[PDB]
Design an enzyme around this catalytic site. Sequence first.
Site, PDB file in Angstrom:
ATOM      1  N   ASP A 122       0.687  -1.093  -0.263  1.00  8.30           N
ATOM      2  CA  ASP A 122       0.052  -0.096  -0.007  1.00  8.30           C
ATOM      3  C   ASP A 122       0.829   1.318   0.119  1.00  8.30           C
ATOM      4  OD1 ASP A 122      -2.373   1.353  -0.254  1.00  8.30           O
ATOM      5  OD2 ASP A 122      -2.554   1.651   1.999  1.00  8.30           O
ATOM      6  N   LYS A 124       2.023   4.988  -1.017  1.00 12.37           N
ATOM      7  CA  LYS A 124       1.401   6.047  -1.504  1.00 12.37           C
ATOM      8  C   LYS A 124       1.789   7.197  -0.850  1.00 12.37           C
ATOM      9  CE  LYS A 124      -2.153   5.096   2.011  1.00 12.37           C
ATOM     10  NZ  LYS A 124      -3.584   4.390   2.200  1.00 12.37           N
ATOM     11  N   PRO A 125       1.963   8.423  -1.315  1.00 11.59           N
ATOM     12  CA  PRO A 125       2.403   9.526  -0.652  1.00 11.59           C
ATOM     13  C   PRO A 125       2.537   9.800   0.745  1.00 11.59           C
ATOM     14  CG  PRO A 125       1.811  10.213  -3.038  1.00 11.59           C
ATOM     15  CD  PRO A 125       1.201   8.849  -2.855  1.00 11.59           C
TER      16      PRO A 125
END
Length: 286
Positions: A122, A124-125
């Site tokens: 997972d 993400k930024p």
Amino acid sequence: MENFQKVEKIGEGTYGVVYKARNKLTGEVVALKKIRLGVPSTAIREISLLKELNHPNIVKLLDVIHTENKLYLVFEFLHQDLKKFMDASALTGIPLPLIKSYLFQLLQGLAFCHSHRVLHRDLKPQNLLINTEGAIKLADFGLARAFGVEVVTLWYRAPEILLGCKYYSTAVDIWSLGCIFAEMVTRRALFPGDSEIDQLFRIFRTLGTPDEVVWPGVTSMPDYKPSFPKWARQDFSKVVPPLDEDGRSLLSQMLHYDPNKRISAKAALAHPFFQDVTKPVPHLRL
Ligand SMILES: C[C@@H](O)[C@@H](C)Nc1ccnc(Nc2ccc(S(N)(=O)=O)cc2)n1
């Protein structure tokens, strides 16, 4: 919880709320994650393996506190996330040398995790954390598999996950980091889907609808439908201007449909894009 004084809420995730907090005894400043729920034994053991998965590009898990049938994870505190940094840098863009540095470090972090057979799943930024010294670190590493469980962002999800594959490989993380690389460079999310099918179809519209030629076995995946529309592939020249041709080659290898064809983190580190890597200092407003 009694051991810490909450300072402020800093995140809300699938597995719980995160606070910036101070240790009452020592004054250490940490990120305190209250895991959402006693705790299954298997989760405890997987989390305990994460405590030894230490690397400079992985957010340090300081302590696991399993008491009164609650689970808290105590992390080292980093000062800003990549989302906030990107949003802060949106007028001029993250300078390329810094992008390249952040990509290289994240690849080092993944190569290390992958070498121990641990996946993120997972990226993400919001899970990439930076400091004033030029470092970037993977956070919440290994938690998806440990726990197994307000809107979930799909923007970084590999296509094999969307197509219903039961067993994830390390390639899922390369795909996600590829997406993030593009976003740093262009200042727009590459695939900003708002449902699983919109996410899949946004991928297909850009990279071409996958078929048996580019992805052998694709048509037998659980959620593959012969009825999917057939879109032609776009050139990376149109997908990520002003990425230079080395950046584009490397990106294309991170975004191969067939996870088996997708570049490994280890191999990515030797890519010609990194021949001139450096470690600049970001300008962080804290
Ligand atoms: C990964 C995610 O759960 C995050 C909440 N976890 C951690 C862990 C360690 N340190 C942080 N720090 C932090 C986070 C965000 C910001 S923000 N949104 O102001 O840029 C400033 C600092 N966060």
